Nucleic acid binder design. Structure first.
Length: 246
DNA sequence: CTGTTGGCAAGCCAGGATCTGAACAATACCGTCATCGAGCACTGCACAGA
């Protein structure tokens, strides 16, 4: 679960070794973190995920509170309160509503993980210029990040596959902070602006599925359904045991 | 064996005009994204029974 267990790849703001923390450790400490992945595009995909998460779990009621939470980390009790009604929507492996997935996908073959690795494959020259086996075994964090990247920044897999709400390959622009905690909070719209931004079906595509060949008025989409939009029918396979993430 | 020297080298004036210098037609195409499943091929597989 993205709200509970460790999955966030960080290292100290000016420190060294990578450690995998959880959302609570990020929101409830004056520790300075910065995202750390081998790819800048995945670091951005991760931040986008974090921001979209913090957008639904803790919009400030006003600018006064907005400035307060930035300078002051929440307490673990406040955090648990806020994440409580959302735990149900952030499960990777889940019975009826897997995170950004769709149970019951009819496919003759199993798609390799490289197809979510945005650029490792996609062109006829990729197999010649890129290193093989980058997607043989992806950890939980990278998998979610990759899924979120495909739905937002990357183009569709091919014919019959749709792209995100902003279209194919949009430019994402976030306000930069001093550390990871501040940056995430800095990009969360306060409740008033949130209402002015979105004046609907406010349930995800993996809980309230999209109907085939249906026409959807853009105004009929809730902000959480849109932020976590999944234009593609994707279903993860059963994972494997302990080892290095490729 | 022995072969020279001085003194001197110009000035005037004059070089053109006419009129003319192009047009047409034509400049390419292919491949270097991907997806899915189906319909239809090499291609070995032993055999059973010939």
């Amino acid at each position: 679960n993205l709200l509970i267990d460790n999955w966030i790849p960080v290292r100290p703001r000016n420190g060294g070794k990578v450690q995998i923390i959880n959302l609570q450790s990020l929101y409830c400490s004056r520790d300075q973190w910065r995202l750390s992945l081998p790819r800048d595009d995945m670091e951005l995909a991760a931040l986008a995920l974090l921001v979209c998460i913090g957008q639904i779990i803790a919009p400030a009621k006003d600018d006064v509170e907005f400035r307060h939470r930035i300078m002051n980390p929440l307490t673990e009790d406040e955090f648990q309160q806020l994440i409580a009604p959302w735990i149900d929507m952030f499960y990777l492996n889940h019975a009826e509503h897997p995170f950004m997935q769709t149970k019951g996908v009819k496919a003759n073959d199993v798609t390799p993980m490289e197809k979510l690795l945005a650029g490792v494959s996609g062109a006829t020259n990729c197999a010649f210029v890129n290193q093989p086996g980058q997607g043989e075994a992806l950890c939980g964090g990278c998998t979610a990040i990759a899924l979120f990247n495909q739905a937002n920044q990357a183009p569709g897999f091919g014919g019959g596959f749709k792209s995100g709400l902003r279209g194919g390959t949009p430019v994402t622009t976030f306000v930069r902070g001093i550390d990871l905690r501040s940056t995430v909070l800095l990009n969360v719209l306060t409740l008033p602006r949130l209402q002015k931004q979105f004046p609907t079906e406010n349930q995800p595509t993996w809980i309230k599925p999209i109907k085939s060949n249906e026409s959807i008025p853009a105004s009929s989409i809730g902000f959480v359904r849109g932020l976590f939009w999944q234009p593609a029918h994707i279903e993860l396979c059963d994972p494997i045991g302990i080892g290095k993430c490729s």
